[PDB]
Design a protein around this ligand. Structure first.
Ligand SMILES: [Mg+2]
Ligand SMILES: [Mg+2]
Ligand SMILES: [Mg+2]
Ligand SMILES: [Mg+2]
Ligand SMILES: [Mg+2]
Ligand SMILES: [Mg+2]
Ligand SMILES: [Mg+2]
Ligand SMILES: [Mg+2]
Ligand SMILES: [Mg+2]
Ligand SMILES: [Mg+2]
Ligand SMILES: [Mg+2]
Ligand SMILES: [Mg+2]
Ligand SMILES: [Mg+2]
Ligand SMILES: [Mg+2]
Ligand SMILES: [Mg+2]
Ligand SMILES: [Mg+2]
Ligand SMILES: [Mg+2]
Ligand SMILES: [Mg+2]
Ligand SMILES: [Mg+2]
Ligand SMILES: [Mg+2]
Ligand SMILES: [Mg+2]
Ligand SMILES: [Mg+2]
Ligand SMILES: [Mg+2]
Ligand SMILES: [Mg+2]
Lengths: 377, 48, 106, 46
RNA sequence: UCUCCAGGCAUACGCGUAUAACAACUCGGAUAACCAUUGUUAGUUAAUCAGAAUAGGCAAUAAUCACACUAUAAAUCACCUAUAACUUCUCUGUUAACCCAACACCGGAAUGCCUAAAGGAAAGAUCCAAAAAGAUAAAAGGAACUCGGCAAACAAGAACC
RNA sequence: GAGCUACCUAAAAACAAUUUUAUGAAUCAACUCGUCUAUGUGGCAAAAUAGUGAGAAGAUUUUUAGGUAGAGGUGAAAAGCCU
């Protein structure tokens, strides 16, 4: 019965093993932290130079790069799989579109470049409000929901490690920090968690793209500002889960402008990049509110939806936050990968003349209604 | 073109055509690692 | 007369310009509408407190949001709460709103 | 205290005080330039 | 891997290749290893970070969690009326252990966040001499020292001119 | 020549905890200063270091740009400052 001392590395020694043990000490404080707000504070109290991810970004193939930063696999299509007043919903949607362009006056904008963008923003804003009310009788969950316009959704996570290339810290191990600071045009937050689109740990043949180069090759720069994990509302908010996000593509990224710049393939890549970035940030922030963080992988998958439009076209994406353990230490033997499903863009209405909206397609309206009606079990 | 005069443009002016160009460029092997699509060039400082 | 215009005499000057007589208090017809408990919303007191708390503290990452962001939020939130009564009254579907409209008369 | 660090470099301060436009403002400054051109100086001003 | 120390990462002003790899071993580092040195080759990628139309009319009511509460030192373009124009992505900053002090100077240097998760090494090998410098401990006594309780103290209390 | 320094104009920034109260009040950091002793003395330093001390919501400190020039400037007057 020899009570040997434990075979572990020293705490205060200047060695990699000793450093790792000190890291475990810090993580212990998070594990024993009483409340979620204290958990977040301890995690993000220290600010280091971090990549700033932009959900709406013009960089080529940003969608593929964003998957690696998030470990999200994009599967084309919808997730694997009552009575509706289409006359009222169809008429109401036309009223918002027509009322805005043909009717209403405001003060004609000063800048000659944001007029169409300003017009596009208002139709999206009004249409959402009406649909939420018009779909409320069919689904009572929306009544308990909270509707926010142009609120901020943030998420800061660590993924990957690098050796500092130059300077006095040459060769010191440095984690790769990424952040997403987003202002989705419209979002719906509900108290109850939405149902899962697929069982947790579901395996798929498709694999995350692996990028040979560093994140700096596609324009992506680093700054040191406050790290924030924000779901659009503080922790005290009773409504902490998410239902759906509405995003508007900026004018520069619209279909016609990309064609002239010769990046025709990026017409749909722009949609994918925003969907992956924003939904992960929103779902990722939600997990932290429930207390899950990188070391403590999420037990119950978090699911949220988003709809992305350029003003006329619409594309809808579904997301699932299988894992937050996206770090070299915590990703050593993690077989769980986040899953995202997306659909191609569809034109809601071809164009408007006189008092009639030409080329209105019901299919786009039906898909929006289906997303709004999804409810917790 | 470089070391030459560009006509001043005012509303309604014609399009500017440079028939013979002074800008000469050279392609270089990247110093760092670059994406397969990315290509590096060294160009005259007055080129946009 | 425009937004920034401030009348020195307040209400009295406004009464003269529009040729109107002032009655203190809301009309009895409007007041009696909410006296009926049937119009009372579920968890009305609690939901209003959340909106006030959301309006002033929880909406922005900052510590003390400025009035440029919580006077619109409070009014917008309440209207999106009063507009939840469509379930009781389907007739409320016959209205829509606008923003920053232009009204003028001579 | 410890002297020797009077020079607290500022490019805006430097160019305003001993710059080209500053020197040309006055004839007394232009005559500073004129002498420097006579001597053969590499730099006539800042 | 072990032992120990405890201002660190960005920004601005500034500096101007001191950044990074390779190759040299003349010079520089106050000595070596190694390079901060020499030569050659490279480098810092932004519509978001940062920097760079006209003529009139008219504003009594701070801030401080702005509610209460008072005070005194009395306190940050907008909105309208008309005219003119009707769909855009160029340019420049971005490296480093860095700056002011003849120096790889125990000195000077503003703001943000955090206090070790970040950043570092007091001893080239020896040896135990005097003198000198610093730290700690004291039998008995307790200012008898001294120009003076200077310095130090298990004290840091009281009154006076 | 006012990038040091004396003064001023403009645009700005910093001040934790504790007790008083409602303040050129108190304890004491950051920060500003520089009473005393010691070391140093071609020194780390052409004025520093180690201790010990004074102020620390104010006549406060600090940052940025500008102004005052030698028969002069500035000066809570030391004939003090003005590279
Ligand atoms: Mg370390
Ligand atoms: Mg000098
Ligand atoms: Mg100075
Ligand atoms: Mg080097
Ligand atoms: Mg070598
Ligand atoms: Mg030396
Ligand atoms: Mg070299
Ligand atoms: Mg910018
Ligand atoms: Mg830098
Ligand atoms: Mg040593
Ligand atoms: Mg020794
Ligand atoms: Mg002793
Ligand atoms: Mg003794
Ligand atoms: Mg005596
Ligand atoms: Mg004494
Ligand atoms: Mg000055
Ligand atoms: Mg004075
Ligand atoms: Mg205080
Ligand atoms: Mg003094
Ligand atoms: Mg004191
Ligand atoms: Mg005192
Ligand atoms: Mg005081
Ligand atoms: Mg005298
Ligand atoms: Mg002198």
């Amino acid at each position: 019965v020899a009570r040997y001392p434990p075979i572990v590395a020293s705490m205060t020694a200047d060695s990699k093993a000793a450093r790792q043990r000190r890291v475990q000490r810090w993580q212990a404080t998070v594990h024993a932290a009483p409340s979620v707000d204290e958990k977040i504070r301890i995690l993000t109290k220290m600010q280091f130079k971090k990549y700033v991810v932009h959900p709406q970004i013009s960089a080529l193939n940003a969608d593929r790069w964003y998957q690696s930063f998030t470990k999200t696999v994009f599967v084309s299509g919808l997730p694997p799989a009552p009575s509706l007043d289409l006359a009222a919903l169809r008429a109401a949607v036309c009223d918002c579109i027509l009322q805005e362009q043909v009717y209403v006056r405001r003060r004609r904008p000063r800048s000659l470049f944001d007029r169409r963008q300003a017009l596009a923003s208002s139709i999206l804003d009004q249409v959402v409000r009406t649909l939420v009310n018009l779909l409320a009788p069919l689904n009572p969950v929306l009544s308990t929901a909270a509707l926010d316009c142009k609120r901020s959704v943030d998420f800061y996570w660590l993924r990957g490690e690098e050796r500092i290339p130059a300077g006095h810290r040459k060769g010191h191990i440095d984690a790769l920090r990424y952040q997403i600071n987003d202002k989705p045009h419209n979002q719906i937050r509900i108290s109850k968690q939405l149902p899962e689109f697929v069982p947790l740990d579901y395996s798929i043949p498709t694999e995350i793209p692996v990028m040979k180069c560093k994140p700096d090759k596609l324009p992506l720069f680093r700054r040191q500002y406050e790290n924030s994990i924000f779901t659009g509302s503080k922790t005290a908010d009773p409504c902490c889960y998410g239902h759906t996000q509405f995003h508007l593509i900026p004018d520069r990224l619209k279909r016609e402008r990309l064609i002239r710049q010769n990046q025709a393939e990026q017409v749909e890549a722009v949609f994918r990049a925003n969907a992956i970035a924003s939904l992960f940030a929103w779902t990722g922030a939600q997990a932290m509110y429930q207390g899950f963080w990188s070391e403590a992988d999420v037990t119950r998958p978090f699911v949220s939806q988003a709809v992305i439009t350029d003003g006329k076209y619409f594309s809808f994406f579904c997301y699932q936050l299988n894992t937050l353990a996206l770090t070299v230490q915590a990703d050593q033997n993690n077989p769980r990968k986040n899953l995202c499903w997306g659909s191609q863009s569809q034109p809601l209405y071809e164009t408007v003349e006189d008092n009639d909206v030409k080329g209105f397609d019901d299919g786009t309206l039906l898909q929006i209604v289906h997303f709004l009606l999804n409810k917790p079990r | 073109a470089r070391n030459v005069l560009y006509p001043l443009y005012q509303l309604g002016g014609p399009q500017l055509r440079v028939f013979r160009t002074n800008f000469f460029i050279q392609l270089v092997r990247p110093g760092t690692a670059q994406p397969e699509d990315t290509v590096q060039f060294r160009i005259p400082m007055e080129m946009t | 007369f425009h937004q920034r215009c401030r009348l020195l005499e307040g209400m009295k000057q406004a009464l003269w310009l529009t040729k109107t007589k002032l009655i203190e208090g809301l009309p009895k017809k409007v007041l009696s509408l909410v006296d009926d408990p049937a119009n009372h919303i579920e968890n009305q007191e609690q939901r209003v407190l959340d909106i006030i708390s959301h309006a002033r503290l929880w909406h922005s990452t900052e510590d003390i949001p400025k009035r440029e962001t919580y006077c619109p939020l409070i009014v917008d939130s309440l209207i999106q709460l009063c507009k939840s009564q469509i379930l009781k009254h389907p007739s409320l579907a016959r209205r829509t709103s606008a923003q920053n409209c232009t009204l003028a008369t001579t | 205290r410890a002297r020797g660090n009077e020079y607290q470099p500022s490019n805006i301060k430097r160019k305003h005080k001993h710059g080209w436009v500053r020197r040309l403002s006055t004839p007394a400054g232009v005559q500073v330039i004129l002498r420097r051109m006579l001597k053969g100086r590499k730099s006539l001003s800042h």
